[PDB]
Design a protein around this motif. Sequence first.
Motif, PDB file in Angstrom:
ATOM      1  N   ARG A  25       0.995  -1.039  -0.100  1.00  0.00           N
ATOM      2  CA  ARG A  25      -0.106  -0.109   0.019  1.00  0.00           C
ATOM      3  C   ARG A  25       0.843   1.125   0.218  1.00  0.00           C
ATOM      4  O   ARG A  25       0.635   2.354  -0.633  1.00  0.00           O
ATOM      5  N   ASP A  46       2.768   1.617  -4.219  1.00  0.00           N
ATOM      6  CA  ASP A  46       2.133   1.680  -5.438  1.00  0.00           C
ATOM      7  C   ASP A  46       0.646   1.429  -5.316  1.00  0.00           C
ATOM      8  O   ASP A  46       0.271   0.211  -5.151  1.00  0.00           O
ATOM      9  N   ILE A  47      -0.242   2.366  -5.193  1.00  0.00           N
ATOM     10  CA  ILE A  47      -1.743   2.134  -4.903  1.00  0.00           C
ATOM     11  C   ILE A  47      -2.436   1.482  -5.968  1.00  0.00           C
ATOM     12  O   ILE A  47      -3.578   0.874  -5.839  1.00  0.00           O
ATOM     13  N   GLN A  48      -2.022   1.588  -7.216  1.00  0.00           N
ATOM     14  CA  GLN A  48      -2.554   1.296  -8.534  1.00  0.00           C
ATOM     15  C   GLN A  48      -2.535  -0.256  -8.475  1.00  0.00           C
ATOM     16  O   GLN A  48      -3.630  -1.248  -8.862  1.00  0.00           O
ATOM     17  N   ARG A  49      -1.379  -0.898  -8.278  1.00  0.00           N
ATOM     18  CA  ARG A  49      -1.335  -2.111  -7.944  1.00  0.00           C
ATOM     19  C   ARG A  49      -2.157  -2.851  -6.742  1.00  0.00           C
ATOM     20  O   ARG A  49      -2.524  -3.955  -6.703  1.00  0.00           O
ATOM     21  N   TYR A  50      -2.155  -2.119  -5.647  1.00  0.00           N
ATOM     22  CA  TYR A  50      -2.880  -2.529  -4.723  1.00  0.00           C
ATOM     23  C   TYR A  50      -4.329  -2.645  -4.962  1.00  0.00           C
ATOM     24  O   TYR A  50      -5.220  -3.870  -4.713  1.00  0.00           O
ATOM     25  N   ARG A  51      -4.880  -1.757  -5.679  1.00  0.00           N
ATOM     26  CA  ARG A  51      -6.459  -1.930  -6.232  1.00  0.00           C
ATOM     27  C   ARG A  51      -6.296  -2.973  -7.195  1.00  0.00           C
ATOM     28  O   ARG A  51      -7.432  -3.757  -7.107  1.00  0.00           O
ATOM     29  N   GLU A  52      -5.404  -3.229  -7.844  1.00  0.00           N
ATOM     30  CA  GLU A  52      -5.280  -4.413  -8.904  1.00  0.00           C
ATOM     31  C   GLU A  52      -5.503  -5.660  -8.156  1.00  0.00           C
ATOM     32  O   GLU A  52      -6.274  -6.710  -8.486  1.00  0.00           O
TER      33      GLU A  52
END
Lengths: 117, 66, 275, 97, 88
Positions: free
Chosen positions: E70, E73-79
């Motif tokens: 978290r 890289d928040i984008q991979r987290y949501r991914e």
Amino acid sequence: KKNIESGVAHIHSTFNNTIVMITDTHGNALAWSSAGSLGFKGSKKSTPFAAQMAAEAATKVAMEHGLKTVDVTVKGPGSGREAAIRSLQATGLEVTAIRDVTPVPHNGCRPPKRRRV
Amino acid sequence: KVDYIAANHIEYIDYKDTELLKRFISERGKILPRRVTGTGAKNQRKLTIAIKRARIMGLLPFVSDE
Amino acid sequence: AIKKYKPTTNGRRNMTSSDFAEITTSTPEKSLLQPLKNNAGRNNNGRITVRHQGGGHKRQYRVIDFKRNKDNVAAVVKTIEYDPNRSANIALVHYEDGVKAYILAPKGLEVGMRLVSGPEADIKVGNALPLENIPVGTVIHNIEMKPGKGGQLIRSAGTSAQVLGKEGKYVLIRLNSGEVRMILATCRATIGSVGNEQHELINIGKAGRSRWMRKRPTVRGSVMNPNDHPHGGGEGKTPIGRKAPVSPWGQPAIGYKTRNKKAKSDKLIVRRRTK
Amino acid sequence: QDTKYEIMYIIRPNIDEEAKTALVERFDTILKDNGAEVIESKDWEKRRLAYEMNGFREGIYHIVNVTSPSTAGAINEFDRLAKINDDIIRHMIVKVE
Amino acid sequence: AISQERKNEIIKEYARHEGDTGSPEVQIAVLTEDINQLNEHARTHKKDHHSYRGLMKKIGHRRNLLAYLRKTDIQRYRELIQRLGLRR
RNA sequence: UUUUC
RNA sequence: AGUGCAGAAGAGGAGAGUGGAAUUCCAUGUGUAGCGGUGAAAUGCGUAGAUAUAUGGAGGAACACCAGUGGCGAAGGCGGCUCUCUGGUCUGUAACUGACGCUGAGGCUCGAAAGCGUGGGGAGCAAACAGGAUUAGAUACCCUGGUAGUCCACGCCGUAAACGAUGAGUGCUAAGUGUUGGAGGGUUUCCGCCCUUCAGUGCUGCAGCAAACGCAUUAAGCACUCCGCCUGGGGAGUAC
């Protein structure tokens, strides 16, 4: 009677008594004696001497029914259990094999309260 | 330095070889200890479990009195 | 399992009842129902013989096997239902011939099993074998006493038996309540133990719920006037002034064995352990 | 994978030899039904017993060898049927490595 | 718990490129299916404790890797939380 | 392997 | 700090089935005046046949030798055997992730024995209790009996000399000698020596500490981080 001519005797010797009984080859009981049976009491049944005289008094009636050889069963870890055998040799028997079987368990039960004296 | 039995290159104890098995028992029938026979620790354990399997199927007696 | 109702009113504090979770359906068939009367324990002559009966709901027969003579034909089991008569649960059975009747359902029956009843059928839960072919150490019900009646020994809920040892004749069996009995070897049985386990785990709670079951209140003996009951009378509360407390007909209550026991079965009975 | 098995059981002496073959084929069929690759089977000996078992002091020793996936119930159908017989005294199932 | 067959299977679809046996996406995926099978084990054998401790340690480790992921890289987290079904 | 100092 | 690749050991846990020996009870054969008990006796059992002795039958509990300063687990603890499910540890390598770590107030989980609820079981053992002895007295030690309990399932309580009376994480500082599991070099049939290297596990010892005791690479030595705790003995882990 009948000249049984063989059999197995029994020896059982506590810390306060020793008892002998003589059987057939299977055997039914022929005649038996005890340290107390010869008119003794209490403490003095622990001696090897009483074992001698009781075993010999058993043999006297044992060979009045036809008996030459005998094997020896020994239970009862005690004291006079050797003098029983050796006076059994004394007054006219032909002991040819001795099995000392006092059975060990494999830790199944518990002994009582381990005494505080 | 006491000679263990594993000089031959036998891996699996074969579970029934009575020639490979009577060395470790008493004449009465117990188990001889590891210091008596002089072997490594794991082979003691392998022979122990092997003859504990072998005592059930009648391949070896429990008690030899009679 | 067991429900525990939350205490809302004082006749609901300590209620319990089952879930009826095992029961699949709620619809009996036409073909297996037969009517019933109440009796309230009254004879041909119309007098009370067994006290404290009558006065409850309505019931019907459900005709249930005890014989299982159609052998070498498989049988599908589809439902698990009531009797109001028996304590339990009871199952429908579709023979592949196209014949229906019920069967006492033991533990472990699922819908879709097949129960075979020959003299050499396999040994699982629900089969029906003659007592010769059953090996040593199983759990058994519907034991026929005499060959051809159908079962009369252990039927009701949560009970069991075992097989101690065969002879040439007879077969020994441990019943419930400890006993051992000689039983002929040509009798039928089942394999398993009965369904509901929990009838001793149910508070009845109200008076009305045990009054729904066809019961009636039972007066204490020592309250009666002295001419309906030999304990009675006495000003104030009295102890039992008579030696050995008595039923209202004679026959002291605590102590008499009343086996006749000169019975015709003492050769067969070994060790009546708890009676 | 699978797991390798010895399954060695003890047969009565006083049976007839045709019953021996029928018994062997019966238990081989109850193996082969439930997903069990049989591989090998021999008869071991005609041996006596180091102590009496039921009333007997001899026995006929056979061994069957089989592999199966552990999820399959190819063994419990042996375990249920062997110990309810009259002629099989005992039977032992080991992993073989 | 798992076999190597699914362990070979699921590392490949969630690797970012060839040979990503580190790469904390793959590690939290393997931990997810491990804790699902061990949770079935806990449902089966409800009075073990000596594997339920292993559940607790794996959930703690995946928690800490997720909380690391978290912070970068928040984008991979949501991914991943869309991709594996978690975070309630 | 009896109480008492 | 991790994950892949390749190996190794193990009384780590749950579920299910099975084996032998022993004590007691039952049935039957032989057998007759004793048996058991103690420092000494006695209560007790035996002529309605005991003990002893031989054959089977019943049933519950614990697992002889193996067994060791062995091993496993965070602690409590875990030793007959087999199968099903399953956790953790160590060794080579560093191709892969690029600091993802440590400690952790409240919170959650586990927790020897005794105890409580409901249903089972009950062979030994034995709080309460009964009787026999000793003593000035003996509600105790000794002896004969004997229940709840000790076992199983599902819940409850959360305590100990739960101790190495030594909190956890990490780095540094002479050696010597046995053992458990590994991994490399050569002599090599080395699989039976030796040399090097990882971990746990003992014991003797130097600088250094300490009031001495003793500790000492598995520090009570040299140092940083974080957490808990102490301030005379009683009153008391009591009152509210």
